[PDB]
């Protein structure tokens, strides 16, 4: 498969090898925050990463990942509208071009510079694979970011990039404490959606936070200097690797505030 975000590979054109692509619970969505439900059944949101262990930081050739040991219940999220333990397996983020666009999500229609997807995956089905293959098997939490004053928790995140420029490199990337990405509040909307990418499947409890977390343009400029392309190739430079909103069809965003 050779999806990606060009005019001849883009979003528009993932139906053909992925059907799903116009299917019932596809994500993102815009939410309409004059629409969304309070939920006063909603349980907090429990955020647990003091023991996270990051591994390394991969460019895919779609946007970059930083990945962690999941062998083990380290780093999880539980409670909100989740049942069980679902365990962090990456990161990853989603930008534009300006800083107008880049979020993948939409609040009452407004775009951020970028969006963060924390990816866990429900330990009930043993592993990621299994997981991706259920309506309940993951929860990615989503977090926007605006362009203002510096995240310092997102600085060493920045600074390996120069070493990952292109499609398939990865740098040792030990020690990154996601605690650092969060912001002060947890208060979420939540709603059933499908992962972002092909294959799209329909596998993710979607929690996106409330309150977005402010990045510098220096830091966001560093996002958009790496590289689609592999080493050796003509440079296309990694920038609006975001889905746009999709149908919402027959689904509620649940609001975990008021
Ligand atoms: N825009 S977002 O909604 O949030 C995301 N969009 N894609 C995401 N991931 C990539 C992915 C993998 N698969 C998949 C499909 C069939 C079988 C198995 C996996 N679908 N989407 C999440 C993700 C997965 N992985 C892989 O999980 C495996 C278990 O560790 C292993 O192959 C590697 O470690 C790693 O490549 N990493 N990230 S999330
Ligand atoms: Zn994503």
Same mark, same amino acid.
């Given at each position: 498969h050779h999806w990606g975000y060009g005019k001849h590979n883009?979003?528009?054109?993932?139906?053909?090898?992925?059907?799903?692509?116009?299917?019932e619970r596809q994500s993102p969505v815009d939410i309409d925050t004059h629409t969304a439900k309070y939920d006063p059944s909603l349980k907090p949101l429990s955020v647990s990463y003091d023991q996270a262990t990051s591994l390394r930081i991969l460019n895919?050739?779609?946007?970059?990942?930083?990945?962690?040991?999941?062998?083990?219940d380290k780093a999880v999220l539980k409670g909100g509208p989740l049942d069980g333990t679902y365990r962090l397996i990456q990161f990853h983020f989603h930008w534009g071009?300006?800083?107008?666009?880049?979020?993948?999500?939409?609040?009452?229609?407004?775009?951020?510079?970028?969006e963060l997807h924390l990816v866990h995956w429900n330990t009930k089905y043993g592993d990621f694979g299994k997981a991706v293959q259920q309506p309940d098997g993951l929860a990615v939490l989503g977090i926007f970011l605006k362009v203002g004053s510096a995240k310092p928790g997102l600085q060493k995140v920045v600074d390996v990039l120069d070493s990952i420029k292109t499609?398939?490199?990865?740098?040792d990337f030990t020690n990154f404490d996601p605690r650092g990405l969060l912001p002060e509040s947890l208060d979420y909307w939540t709603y059933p959606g499908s992962l972002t990418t092909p294959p799209l499947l329909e596998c993710?409890?979607?929690?996106?936070?409330?309150?977005?977390?402010?990045?510098?343009?220096? &830091?966001? %400029? !560093?996002? #958009?200097?790496?590289?689609?392309?592999?080493?050796?190739?003509?440079?296309?430079?990694?920038?609006?690797?975001?889905?746009?909103? &999709?149908? %919402? !069809?027959? #689904?509620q965003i649940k609001a975990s505030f008021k």
């Open positions: 883009g979003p528009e054109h993932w139906h053909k090898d992925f059907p799903i692509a116009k299917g895919n050739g779609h946007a970059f990942n930083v990945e962690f040991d999941d062998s083990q071009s300006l800083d107008g666009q880049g979020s993948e999500h939409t609040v009452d229609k407004k775009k951020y510079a970028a499609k398939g490199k990865s740098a993710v409890t979607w929690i996106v936070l409330k309150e977005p977390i402010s990045v510098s343009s220096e &830091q966001v %400029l !560093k996002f #958009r200097k790496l590289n689609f392309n592999g080493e050796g190739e003509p440079e296309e430079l990694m920038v609006d690797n975001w889905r746009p909103a &999709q149908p %919402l !069809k027959n #689904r």
